[PDB]
Amino acid sequence: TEEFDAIKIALASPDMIRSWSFGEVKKPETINYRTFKPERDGLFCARIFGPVKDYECLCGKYKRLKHRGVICEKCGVEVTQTKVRRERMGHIELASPTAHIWFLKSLPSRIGLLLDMPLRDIERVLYFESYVVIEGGMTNLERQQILTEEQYLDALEEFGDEFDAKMGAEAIQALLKSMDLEQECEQLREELNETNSETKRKKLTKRIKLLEAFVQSGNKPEWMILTVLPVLPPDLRPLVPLDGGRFATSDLNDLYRRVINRNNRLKRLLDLAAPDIIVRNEKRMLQEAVDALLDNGRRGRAITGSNKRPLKSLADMIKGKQGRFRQNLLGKRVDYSGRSVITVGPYLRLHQCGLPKKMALELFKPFIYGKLELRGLATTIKAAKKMVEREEAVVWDILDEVIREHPVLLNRAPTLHRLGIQAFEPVLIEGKAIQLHPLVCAAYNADFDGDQMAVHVPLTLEAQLEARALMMSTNNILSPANGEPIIVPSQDVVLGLYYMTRDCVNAKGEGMVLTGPKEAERLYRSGLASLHARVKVRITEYEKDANGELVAKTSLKDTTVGRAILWMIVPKGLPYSIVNQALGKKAISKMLNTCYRILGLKPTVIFADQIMYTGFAYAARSGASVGIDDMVIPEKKHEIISEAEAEVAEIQEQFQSGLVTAGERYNKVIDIWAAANDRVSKAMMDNLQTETVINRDGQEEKQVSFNSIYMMADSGARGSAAQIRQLAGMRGLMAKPDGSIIETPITANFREGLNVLQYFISTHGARKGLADTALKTANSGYLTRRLVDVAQDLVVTEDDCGTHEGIMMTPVIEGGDVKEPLRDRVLGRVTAEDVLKPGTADILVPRNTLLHEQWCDLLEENSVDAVKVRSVVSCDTDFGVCAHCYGRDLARGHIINKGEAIGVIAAQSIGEPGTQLTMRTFHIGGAASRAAAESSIQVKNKGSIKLSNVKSVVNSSGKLVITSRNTELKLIDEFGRTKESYKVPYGAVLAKGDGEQVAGGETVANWDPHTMPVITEVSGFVRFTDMIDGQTITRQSLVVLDSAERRPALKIVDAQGNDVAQYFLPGKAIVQLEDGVQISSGDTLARIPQDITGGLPRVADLFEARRPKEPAILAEISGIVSFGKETKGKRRLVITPVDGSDPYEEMIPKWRQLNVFEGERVERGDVISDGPEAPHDILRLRGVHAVTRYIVNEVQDVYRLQGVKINDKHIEVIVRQMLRKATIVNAGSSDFLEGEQVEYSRVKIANRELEANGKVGATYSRDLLGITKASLATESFISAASFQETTRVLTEAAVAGKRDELRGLKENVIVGRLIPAGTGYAYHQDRMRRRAAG
Amino acid sequence: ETTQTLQDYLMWQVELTPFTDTDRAIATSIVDAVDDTGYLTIQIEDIVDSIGDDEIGLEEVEAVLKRIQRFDPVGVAAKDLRDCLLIQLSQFAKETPWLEEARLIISDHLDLLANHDFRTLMRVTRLKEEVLKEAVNLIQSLDXXXXXXXXXXXXXXXXXXXXXXXXXXXXXXXXXXXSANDTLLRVSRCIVEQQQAFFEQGEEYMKPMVLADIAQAVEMHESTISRVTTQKYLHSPRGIXXXXXXXXXXXXXXXXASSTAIRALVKKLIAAENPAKPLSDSKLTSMLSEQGIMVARRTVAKYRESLSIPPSNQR
Amino acid sequence: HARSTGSYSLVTQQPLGGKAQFGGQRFGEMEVWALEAYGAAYTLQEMLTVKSDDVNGRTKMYKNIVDGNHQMEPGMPESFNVLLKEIRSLGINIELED
Amino acid sequence: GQNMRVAFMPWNGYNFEDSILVSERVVQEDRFTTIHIQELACVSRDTKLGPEEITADIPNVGEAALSKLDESGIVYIGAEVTGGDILVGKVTPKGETQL
Amino acid sequence: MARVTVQDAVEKIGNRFDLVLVAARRARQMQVGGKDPLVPEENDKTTVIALREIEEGLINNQILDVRERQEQQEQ
DNA sequence: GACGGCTGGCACGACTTTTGCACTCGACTAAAGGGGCGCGCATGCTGT
DNA sequence: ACAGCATGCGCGCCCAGGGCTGATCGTGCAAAAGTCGTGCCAGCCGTC
């Protein structure tokens, strides 16, 4: 009846069952069917559960229930709780303590294991014959042994007296009763130290943790077998859906009366002193009876019934549907929603929606009843209804005051993000359709084809404020996953503003002065053109330059009529130059952007509304149409075609000569028709000029054409030049579901009819393109469920925890041109420690601050290449995030508050992008097919280059090559920031020597994949080796040896007269020279060469942390690696040397490439490459930071291909959610070598350093995995399995006794309560202080 | 349609009309006495004594019960059936062609003798011509008054069982409808076909049937024969009534019908009889003895007067 | 369709499945994820229980709307207690602590 | 279908995305007005309490609802039925109510 | 008086969660009864009147606490 | 106004019918108990 | 004295095979229950 903070599950006791409820039934007499009155004893009847109806009973006393806690005659008096039927249950009393079926063992099955003995033995002695010997001693036998009927007869014969053996579990209750848990646990630890067997480790840990769970739980293990058995309320049993339900036909009811019958038989036979086999058969068949009660099985098939019901009884029937399901979880009905078709209209300011009057009357019907009964016209509620269906004109006058300020919720069937649902103020409209505000086609993502829409009405009271605060659309102008302004104008608005601001030359009137300018009045008076001329006008302009003040001025400026008319809409002080240019969708989005940044929210929402109004107004009076004369046919295109085939007929002729194959001819044809497509495209762009022009002569381009196609494609409103290339000019190439492009493209366009072969081949592309949408949409919507499934448990807790260590933020860019600067990465968040200027002792920030446009401009005008930034992970805070590092609070701004839910926007934000990429990873190779000629490594922009991760190799030529595995190139922007950063191919041949730098030109590398450096750095003949068969069969000047099937490296020869450095193993090598042949430095000795992130199925591998095919080994501190040093006779490339203790050794089975040829003693963090790196070896060696930037930078590199932006915050939150469940290296208080929680480890370390003891708990190893094992690692058992079996979860929580502690989401959702997220969370705090007040 | 009915809906209507404390308590004490007819409040003294004194007089509960009688299905509870009729007349129209007054005269008293016939009462109410007949038409247009619940959308069809067909002047079973199941149904379709052959409905009633004959035919156990025909109902071309053609007697006479034609034809002979009100059981027993049925007149009078028969109260 | 309050069903005490017969549409866990994304609390509370699966909550809430109280009368109705009983049938216990 | 005069121009935002505007004269001219036909069927059965009859009397129904029903309980051809009205009734028996 | 943006009223004590609960418990007094508004009524519902009282600064958590102490002391 | 005859209602006895035990009685499901196949691995004889 | 390969053994997994339950199905019967007959007693009436 009060708030539920948390509970631990404990094992109930017979005294606890006698405590809770009370009842006595000695007879299976329920109800006489010719009476229908309460009867004596019995179950399923009104004899227990207090009164049968309301509060009353038929006894002859205690009918008013003035006393409680006893039974009267045929009706239970005790209530002591509440309600009527569902109240206190009652129980039955078994003579011999028995049953449970799945008590000790959960299959498995901790009990029957903790005691220490096989499960087959206990399962065998509970049933059938075999007995357990107890009260042993004085002989060699022990109580742990088991006996059989033959061993029982011979046992009582030989051992004689003091021998006790029982059929039931009473012998188990005494044997378990004589057990001492503390001394047993001590012996299990003493045996845990001595025994090194791995199989013994897990058993001892399980037994110890069990026994401890019994120590702190306070539950007696003997309570597992219950004497008193309670019964459930009969009406809570769901009846069979087929035909009608009956409580007497209940599947468990027959089993209940069956257990009552076997109980009466047991009492009669025990009181009758029946033979032993009889009463013991009664005990065993009673055990089978309760076996039938709880389960349908584990004893075999116990099912009974009239139709032989399958048994989804107590085992499977808890909360129905094999688990906790029915509450929440999809298909419950909404109760006061509606649905209709949406229609657009040019009104209803951003918060409102058109609501049909027929739909509004029924939804607000109860408010109609209330206000009709209130305002004084009414008699009864049924006559008020009569007035409702008679629909007087006064009823709608009531409804007008009903709706008013009480908005309503809108819902689509899909919701891909938070903003998918919004609330709006209803406005009564005539029609059968609902009207929605035009400005947002984005958040709903659906245009109007006639789609159907849902409308939900919350009422409560505070649901109104909750609707007008965190929901109404005017409150959120930004997207939670970006921060870029949504609700950008489009469609008619862009065309109207483009036609409005446009400039004209040489029209009627000009050369005049207008103030204000007052020109708009004339525009309606004609005698002028809105796009005609630029005329000196005096404009007044405000500004914020004075702090807290507005500095004005009025100047004479040149502009066009439409622009100065639009200047009236500018809200008090935006700069004038923003409307002084032709306005496209770009300048519109920048206009609303700068308006929202400068002037805030309330000015820019009404500003956007008015820009909408004038947009559809002047777009309405624009009067633009399409036509056959608007589309022009290029006159040079007929030549471009004739020039194309004249070339093709030549190339095809080469096929007749046999000098050109089909591949070369193919590529040449594709290049010819591609260049022809470019040429006809340029001819189209030059043709669209000078078509519909204003009256004028001469000049050059004559006021660039006003035709609709150039305004649509050029203005960016709806179309674009890409489809204009298909409308005018050629059609280009086509897509066949093959992978080879046809050699006869379509040379015509939609101006003329297409041949049956052109339209016939043109269908294959669409046919191959129609089936992708739903197929990819399936998984695209499937990933979100798993992302929410892992990410739902994180919530906001503290204000500022504070810390020092954090993530170092440095700008990173993709290959070629610059992608993102340091601005967007450092924007917002928190800056740890200090960031110095390029001069010493000068700090930019005193300690830390939330970075906004001003501080970002301070970082822009100054030089800082490294910004220390805080984040999740680090600055770890107990039970959630500190709510400081997470700041910048996307789609809002402030220092981030408390109570929000984290991971729900992080999940939907990552899974919200639809479909997939354009190409699949690097495997398709669409940018470049194989290698044309060379990789072409050179720089472009000015500034010096710096070679990163290079190792010099002596060459005879002035240029020096590099044998390093990974190589980078740095360029100078201003202070040395990265401009062009590209990955240099492994072992690239540099045309520019090392130690030399140049800015621009002079290509510094040449790379072809026929080679890879192995060269003698000194002149003289090749090192002498032995040539033997079996090593010459390797696959890519005779080859000598190969280290794979065993290029083995040997001491370099430093002289031509004497035979006398280190070479890494690529894994595949062919010797290109012969021993004893003169070779010189810089000349080829042996040269020959031997996951892939991106794509959504690969993204699932990024979060799920799949193991790659070829792993990448990493190197630790010390060690010696040169040329397979310390390598054993077998399994080459194993590192022996001690080198400062730390016996670091790695086992490589000789078929894999070598780490490095140099460096000698190495350290932790050195990259030996050897393929794609696994996150486990990175987390184990590099740290958590390299895993964070690993996953984050890879996923970002995946999403950057489509241009979509996702901030690093959410991905970092997922990485933090994947850092759970880390293991400790050394023993803690009491434990060894197992898994644990990072939170509990941190708390136990706080208790380690808190008071006295030097070491309690020790260092740990961080574990990762993800998305699967981390989701099943939840410590709360109520939310542990919404999927897995319920029995094992309730067994672990029952024996362990773990608290609920209620931190999470699905906890308080599934169990139900006000959720500890958002406003309700504050409620949860608002009570605690009250609880702290007394 | 799986909807709440009776004191659930009625009590839900009681909760709407605001009742502070006592009106709600005595209200809930009234609503439980409603029956399927709805106008039976039984004894008011039981509702008063069930309160257990402590004031709450009869005058306070009278207005509460009157408020219960004003609910949605017009007349509710009250007593004597002469009350709810007044409420039906009060809320009906309130503007009528002199129907209100005469409605209060007829509904007030004298309605007991006016239901069978008017006659001399036509001079008592002073009405004449079509005014009295139209008033009686209004009384016939009024209403059981309640019984608006139920909402019985579905009927639970018998769906037959086994079937028969009449050939050339003979009726034979067929067991038409829809290996151990085929033979298991072939046994019932067999013994049922022979039972339909020995028993013909024929003309007028049915031939007497004795379970010993059907049990002697196939040597089947009569317990299993009559046990299946009790639950299941054999559906023939006419009628529904399978166990009725199984259980009978030996009629205790050599010149004869069984209890089926004894009680059936007994009520048929009592159907046309008593030119005014003879109500003579001994005469019907003599008529049964004239046919040779050997009636002791003790069983014919008691068994014939049962099963909806007006006898012997028809006297 | 635009229903308001129609007839209900005996099983789970939920309104009928589809329109014309007056269906109660659908409310999914994805919209639950939306309201939880807003941090919405009382709206989620009313949509899940009182307005959907609560039986007597329709009578109390309805009387609050007719009289103009507009109060939820907070607490945990229905399924919590039924869960206490279905779990209580098993030999393990549930309590209430602060 | 039916061809009509079509104009190409954005007008006051009334055509937005895929939407369309039409005139009132189109509605006045009956153009593309649609007709539909439905079917309702009643069934009579023989229950365990005996056969079912049809109408000729109904309890708990006023005369205004039965005024549109012809003798035998069938509606007049051409009559206008709106909403929850009644077409062809029927009756199922009960018993032991005469005590 | 319609409220287009609630941010101006949230700026008083920034939460954006607390305005719903504080303005809700403030709306309970005028909603149910036994209280009078401190702002002249526009005939609009008390739902917006709550936000307008929060915007005028006359009502907050501390003010409702002091008024609660006054009601407990007067009783 | 008292009494005997007539008749209806009711309790009891006899007839008939049908239910728990008591021992059946021969043509399936698919889930579980056993066995063979194959694979992994540990031991040891041996050639280097 | 150390390393390789052949052999033998233990165990996991899949396939095949038998055996209780299931599907019925039977119903004999002594007795218990339902129903009908039947005699008895009390209530109602007519005329002496």
Author numbering:
A (entry chain D): 14 to 1049, 1058 to 1067, 1075 to 1088, 1097 to 1126, 1133 to 1376
B (entry chain M): 115 to 257, 259 to 293, 335 to 396, 398 to 413, 415 to 473
C (entry chain C): 1244 to 1341
D (entry chain C): 797 to 895
E (entry chain E): 1 to 75
Paper text:
Gene transcription is a fundamental cellular process carried out by the multi-subunit RNA polymerase (RNAP), which is conserved from bacteria to humans (Cramer, 2002, Werner, 2008). The σ54, which controls stress related genes including those involved in nitrogen fixation, nutrient starvation, infection, and other cellular stresses, forms a class of its own (Buck et al., 2000, Merrick, 1993). σ54 recruits RNAP to its promoter sites via binding to the −12 and −24 consensus promoter sequences and forms a stable RPc that rarely spontaneously isomerizes to RPo. Instead, it requires ATPase activators bound remotely upstream of RPc to convert to RPo (Buck et al., 2000). In order to understand how transcription is initiated and how initial de novo synthesis is carried out, we prepared samples to capture the RPo and the RPitc state by binding σ54 R336A to a promoter (−35 to +28) with a pre-opened transcription bubble (mismatch between −10 and −1 by mutating the non-template [NT] strand) to form RPo and then adding UpG di-nucleotide as well as GTP, to allow de novo synthesis of a −1 UpGGG +3 RNA to form RPitc.
In both RPo and where nucleotides were added to RPo, in addition to RPo or RPitc, another conformation in which DNA is yet to fully enter into the RNAP cleft was also captured at 4.1 Å resolution. In this structure, DNA is caught at the RNAP cleft and likely represents an intermediate state en route to RPo (see discussion below), and we term it RPip (for partially loaded DNA). Interestingly, we observe an ∼30° bend/kink in DNA just downstream of −12/−11 toward the RNAP cleft, and the density is sufficient to accommodate both DNA strands, suggesting that the two strands are still in close proximity even though they are not base-paired between −10 and −1. The regions between −10 and −1 are in fact sandwiched between σ54-ELH and RNAP β-lobe on one side and β′ coiled coil within the clamp on the other side. In particular, the highly positive charged β′ coiled coil and loop (residues 305–325) within the clamp and the proline/glycine loop (372PGEP375) in the β-lobe are positioned to stabilize the DNA phosphor-backbone between −10 and −1, suggesting that they play an important role in stabilizing RPip and potentially guiding the DNA to enter the RNAP cleft. To accommodate the DNA path, σ54 ELH, which is single long α helix between residues 317–355 in RPc and RPi, appears to be shorter (no clear density for residues 317–330 in the helical conformation), suggesting that ELH undergoes conformational changes during DNA loading. DNA downstream of +1 only interacts with RNAP at the β′ jaw domain, which forms a basin to accommodate downstream DNA. The RNAP clamp is wide open in RPip while closed in RPo. In RPip, the β′ clamp opens widely, losing interactions with ELH. Although the RPip state reported here has not been established definitely as a bona fide on-pathway intermediate, RPip is broadly consistent with the proposed RPi1.
